[PDB]
Amino acid sequence: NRDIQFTSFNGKDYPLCFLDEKTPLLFQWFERNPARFGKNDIPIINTEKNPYLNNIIKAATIEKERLIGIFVDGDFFPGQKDAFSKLEYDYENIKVIYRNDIDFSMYDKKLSEIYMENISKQESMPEEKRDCHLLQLLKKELSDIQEGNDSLIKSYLLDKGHGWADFYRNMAMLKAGQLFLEADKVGDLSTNSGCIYLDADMIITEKLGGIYIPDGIAVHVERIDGRASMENGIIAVDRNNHPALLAGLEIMHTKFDADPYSDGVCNGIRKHFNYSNEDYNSFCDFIEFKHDNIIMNTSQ
């Protein structure tokens, strides 16, 4: 509304920006084994203990005035893409966005460039503090680089773990509201380009309402027995190319084998706020996404 509000971390004040009740939601489904689903089924796991499509449909049915993205990748059968088109037709606020249809080149770097800056960073490293093996592996990987394969973004399309989904999610979230604009799925703003990423296990039990996040970014924090950690389930951004995620992308461009979750999000947010030596815990209550309307499918 009319007046900007502030919060303090480490004695510095920071602007709270306001994600209105129209801010889009983004879910993600990157599927290794489309063959597990019926040939004309929605290819998202939907079982009583894992009701992920139901969670997404619930969010869409609760937040009628929000766009609901499903950012998808994997070799889907053509009748599963047909199922996805039917979902968009059934629920007019659900918008399916294929990774394949989005250009991520503006966030790319040559593997050769990352490898060689790391070599130079080590080889020039004052003493033998050098990781002998990292130096050795870097020089060999620099050698086995195919012509149209010198891409940090293409490399994550061959990632064998969580890195395939988490790297692309970070870049989807660098695009934020502009993701819907890029996919021609808007029915938005040149300013109001915020977005809230939610993991498909999160359940909106009722209407989110307006949300205040600090300096335009907030993350899932989990607490177990009084210890807090930042988590990848919830990322809320004030706009596209939010500086914290660019900080995270900068680490992904410099640190060889950087983790897209702990470097691409956590470390990036950390650098943006210049944290480090203070309490992780006090930082975690600061950066935490406040909702109270998003439980997981493991609660009573």
Author numbering: 23 to 209, 212 to 300, 302 to 325
Any passages from the paper?
Escherichia coli NleB1, Citrobacter rodentium NleB, and Salmonella enterica SseK1/3 type III effectors fatally glycosyltransfer N-acetyl glucosamine (GlcNAc) from UDP-GlcNAc to arginine residues of death domain-containing proteins that regulate host inflammation, intra-bacterial proteins, and themselves, whose post-translational modification disrupts host immune functions and prolongs bacterial viability inside host cells. All NleB/SseK orthologs have a typical GT-A conformation with two abutting β/α/β Rossmann domains unlike a GT-B consisting of facing each other β/α/β Rossmann domains with a flexible linkage and share a high degree of structural similarity. Several structural cores were revealed for the new arginine N-glycosylation systems: a catalytic DxD motif to position the Mn2+ cofactor and UDP-GlcNAc donor substrate, His-Glu-Asn (HEN) motif to select UDP-GlcNAc as a suitable donor substrate before other sugar donors such as UDP-Glc/Gal, C-terminal loop to stably embrace the UDP-GlcNAc donor substrate, and Helix-Loop-Helix (HLH) domain predicted to select the acceptor targets. The SseK1 effector GlcNAcylates Arg9, Arg190, Arg160, and Arg149 of four proteins involved in methylglyoxal detoxification, namely, GloA, GloB, GloC, and YajL, respectively, and catalyze methylglyoxal detoxification to significantly enhance their activity.
In all apo- and UDP-bound NleB1/SseK1/SseK3 effectors, the DxD motifs lie in the 219YLDADM224/221YLDADM226/224YLDADM229 regions and their quaternary DADM motifs form a Type-I-turn by H-bonding between the backbone CO(i) and NH(i + 3) groups, while the free Asp oxygen (Oδ of Asp221/Asp223/Asp/226) in the DxD motif interacts with the hydroxyl oxygen (Oη of Tyr219/Tyr221/Tyr224), named as a YD bond. In particular, apo NleB1/SseK1/SseK3 effectors have the free oxygen Oδ of the first catalytic aspartate in the DxD motif, ready to catch Mn2+ and UDP-GlcNAc. All N-glycosylated NleB/SseKs form a Type-I-turn in the DxD motif in the ligand-bound state, and the pathogenic NleB1/SseK1/3 toxins also retain Type-I-turn in the DxD motif in the apo state. Apo Clostridium toxin TcnA and apo E. coli NleB2 have twice intertwined Asx-β-turns, where Type-I-turns H-bond between the backbone CO of D284/D218 and the backbone NH of F287/M221, and the Asx-turn C10 H-bonds between the side chain of D284/D218 and NH of D286/D220 in apo TcnA/NleB2. These results indicate that the first catalytic aspartate in Apo TcdA/B, TcsL, SseK1/3, and NleB1 DxD motifs is open to bind Mn2+, whereas those of Apo TcnA, SseK2, and NleB2 are tightly tied by the second aspartate backbone in the Asx-turn of the DxD motif and are unable to bind Mn2+ and their ligand.
